[PDB]
Amino acid sequence: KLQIAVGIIRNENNEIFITRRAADAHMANKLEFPGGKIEMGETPEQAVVRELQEEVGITPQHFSLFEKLEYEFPDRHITLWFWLVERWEGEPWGKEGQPGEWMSLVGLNADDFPPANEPVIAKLKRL
Ligand SMILES: Nc1nc2c([nH]c(=O)n2[C@H]2C[C@H](O)[C@@H](COP(=O)(O)O)O2)c(=O)[nH]1
Ligand SMILES: OC[C@H]1O[C@@](CO)(O[C@H]2O[C@H](CO)[C@@H](O)[C@H](O)[C@H]2O)[C@@H](O)[C@@H]1O
Ligand code: NA
Numbered sequence: 001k002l003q004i005a006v007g008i009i010r011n012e013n014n015e016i017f018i019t020r021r022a023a024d025a026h027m028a029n030k031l032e033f034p035g036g037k038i039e040m041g042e043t044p045e046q047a048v049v050r051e052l053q054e055e056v057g058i059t060p061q062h063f064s065l066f067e068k069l070e071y072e073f074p075d076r077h078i079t080l081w082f083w084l085v086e087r088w089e090g091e092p093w094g095k096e097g098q099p100g101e102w103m104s105l106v107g108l109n110a111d112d113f114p115p116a117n118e119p120v121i122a123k124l125k126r127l
Contacts, residue, residue, distance in 0.1 A: 002078045005047035006035025007060055007085045008124065009092055015102040016124075017056065017092040026076070027114040033082065034092075034100075044081045056100060058090035067123060071116030082120050084127070 009017040018031050034055040038047040049060050066084035070077065094100040110121040 002076060003038040003044070003047075003081070004035055004078050005038050005044045005051055005081045005083065006033040007048050007052045007063070007083050008033050008066055008120075009052070009056070009058070009060075009085045009088070010105070011102065013102075014105045016105055016108070017100060018103045018108075019055065019094065019098050019100040022098070026073070030114050031103075031112040032114065033117075038081070045083075048081065048083045048085075052085070052088070052092075055096055055098070056092040057095040058088040058092050060085045061087045061089065063087070066127075067120050069116065069119065071114075073114075073116075078116065080116055 019034050021027055021030050021032055023029055034052055035048065036051040038044050052058050052060050060083065063083045063085045065081065067082040070079045092100065105124055108121050110118050113121060
């Protein structure tokens, strides 16, 4: 059972900053919204801020919870907190050496992301 906070970073051109997971990680090689595990003593709002600062070097500001869902993977159960981030300080980049780039929302392919993201990718194509 893991609680994961991730940020959907959208610019004014309806593009999202997406990174790719390592070949040796769970959901290897999949595209993803930057994020990570919510630690003990930390709230989901604080988690997404810390995770984005760590992973892509930006500080999320005035964000909202776009979606919260639970997904059962073959060996783990995770609760995902998808935060819509439209304002932030900094310029997103591959701060941890991971691949990262802007992707048009209309071009996103749910099959490229973990299956847990399916409903979120779909909903995004409408916001
Ligand atoms: N960062 C991130 N993790 C995701 C997404 N979708 C999704 O199922 N996950 C899963 C993959 C991992 O099992 C877990 C994240 O944990 P790690 O920080 O250890 O990789 O959440 C997503 O969009 N972003
Ligand atoms: O839960 C997010 C939701 O709460 C509001 C206030 O109604 O925003 C507050 O919480 C955000 C997340 O911590 C902050 O970024 C924001 O600055 C704060 O006002 C809504 O705007 C948002 O949908
Ligand atoms: Na982490």
